[PDB]
Amino acid sequence: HLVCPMSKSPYVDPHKSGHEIWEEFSMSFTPAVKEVVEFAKRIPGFRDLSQHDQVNLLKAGTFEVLMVRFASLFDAKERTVTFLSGKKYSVDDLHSMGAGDLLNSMFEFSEKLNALQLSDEEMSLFTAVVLVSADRSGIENVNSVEALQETLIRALRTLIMKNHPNEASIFTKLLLKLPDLRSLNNMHSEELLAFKV
Amino acid sequence: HLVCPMSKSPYVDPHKSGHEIWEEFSMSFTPAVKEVVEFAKRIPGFRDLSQHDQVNLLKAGTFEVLMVRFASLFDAKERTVTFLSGKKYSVDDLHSMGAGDLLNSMFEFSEKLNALQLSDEEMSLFTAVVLVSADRSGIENVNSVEALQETLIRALRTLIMKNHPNEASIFTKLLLKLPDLRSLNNMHSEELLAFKV
Amino acid sequence: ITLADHICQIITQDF
Amino acid sequence: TLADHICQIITQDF
Ligand code: HEM
Ligand code: HEM
């Protein structure tokens, strides 16, 4: 099996080689990555980072960006996951198919985030903060990224303040998701390396 | 070489077995770990958490707490690292005994954190915030941990706003250190694994 | 070490 | 799957 919901189905043909499975996987997740790229070009300060930092922020923040965007793919009430093809699989189904604790963590993250029911403006501004908050370890001009990060955060607070005048705490709740997304990312690369069993 | 400044020294006697090298090392870091435990017992709402969640917060967050208490081991002006023995070593020294990106990432972090020029009190509350922010994978009462975190965060914002009135932005910066600390934790864990393989 | 590295080729190709 | 050299020191105190 391949239980990543970027798949179009967790079901893998047992009679296809590893690289042909992976290529099928790829023509499913490749569009979603390209939309993170497109989305980055539309963050205005982003185009003003060097080419190297732009690529590095995307290399490191794409997963986090997607976890935010596709959090809606985790139905906490139905206890189902929607895969990219559109089909839904129960949690119980996926656990017997190989899934474990990262799936449960993603449901808890998604439940709490879907709970906020952010609009698309709030979300798109949130995701951009998530992108330029990517781990900085390969970044050359850290100060300029932290200045873009700082600018995008200020817009987030202003937008939240106008949209939730009586609920200021949403803003801090959104920031405190950043370490949660970073743990989901680590565990999820650990899942990727375990691809070698 | 054992280039972790929790060591007494980065020099390892080569006529020593892995298990006794680790014995001496553990002699050096175990007091700092035990001190985290005692700090935790002093954070206002920590002891009211279930026993299991206290332990799982300290299992996952001790490193990030220590990375904050020991940020002064990293002197940016001198490019030296002070080991727990008190001996000082230069980055170039450590780079040739095996150190790399994680060491540099840590100097960057210490530089940014010392820049915020916080009082001890603000530091001890930020560190409580850090601990209760630990990875939530093994946590059984998520809302109680996040309620403790949200109240510590709020307490911290009031103290930072009162003491740095020329700069409320120090609170946001502090918040954005939580994904940084999480990334150092993941980098450092990987270095730890590597030392074992 | 290996992470979202299978993503590298897609990002560089839009650059 | 690690960094749990710290467990023993922490679980002892409880
Ligand atoms: C292009 C980006 C991604 C690639 C190449 C990728 C690849 C993979 C692979 C190979 C696995 C292991 C599958 C298995 O062991 O059966 C996996 C696991 C998983 N991935 Fe992804 N993934 C990507 C992005 C994402 C995103 C954005 C999400 C969530 C929105 C996600 C959610 C999951 C989940 C829930 C699992 C299973 C966790 C568990 O076993 O508990 N992945 N991924
Ligand atoms: C009890 C807690 C800790 C243990 C058991 C531990 C263990 C280790 C081990 C085994 C290594 C690999 C050393 C090598 O390959 O030579 C390492 C690397 C390192 N650790 Fe720790 N560590 C701990 C906490 C910390 C803390 C709190 C800090 C910072 C304040 C830190 C800073 C470093 C650095 C800078 C390196 C080298 C990074 C590099 O190679 O670039 N460690 N640690």
Author numbering:
A (entry chain A), B (entry chain B): 381 to 577
C (entry chain E): 2256 to 2270
D (entry chain F): 2257 to 2270
Paper quotes:
The REV-ERBs, REV-ERBα (NR1D1) and REV-ERBβ (NR1D2), are closely related NRs with critical roles in mammalian physiology, including maintenance of the circadian rhythm, metabolic processes, and immune function. The REV-ERBs are unique among NRs because their ligand-binding domains (LBDs) lack the C-terminal activation function–2 (AF-2) helix 12 important for binding transcriptional coactivator proteins, suggesting that the REV-ERBs should interact exclusively with transcriptional corepressor proteins and solely repress transcription. The iron-centered porphyrin heme has been identified as the endogenous REV-ERB ligand. REV-ERB LBD interacts with NCoR via two ID motifs present within the RID.
Ligand-free (apo) REV-ERBβ LBD exhibited high affinity for ID1 peptide and low affinity for ID2 peptide. Heme decreased LBD affinity for the ID1 peptide but increased LBD affinity for ID2 peptide, effectively equalizing the ID1 and ID2 peptide affinities. To determine the structural basis of this interaction, we solved crystal structures of REV-ERBβ LBD cobound to heme and NCoR ID1 peptide (2.6-Å resolution) or ID2 peptide (2.0-Å resolution) (respectively). The overall root mean square deviation (RMSD) of the complex in the asymmetric unit including LBD, heme, and NCoR ID peptide was 1.1 and 1.3 Å for the ID1- and ID2-bound structures, respectively, suggesting minimal conformational heterogeneity. The ID peptides bound to the AF-2 surface formed electrostatic interactions with the conserved charge clamp residue K421 on helix 3, confirming that the heme-dependent REV-ERBβ corepressor interaction is similar to other NRs. In the crystal structure of apo REV-ERBα LBD bound to NCoR ID1 peptide, an antiparallel β sheet is formed between the N terminus of the ID1 peptide and a β strand extension off helix 11 (10). Although the antiparallel β sheet was lost, the AF-2 interaction with the α-helical region of the ID1 and ID2 peptides containing the I/LxxI/LI/LxxxI/L/F corepressor NR (CoRNR) box motif critical for corepressor binding was preserved.
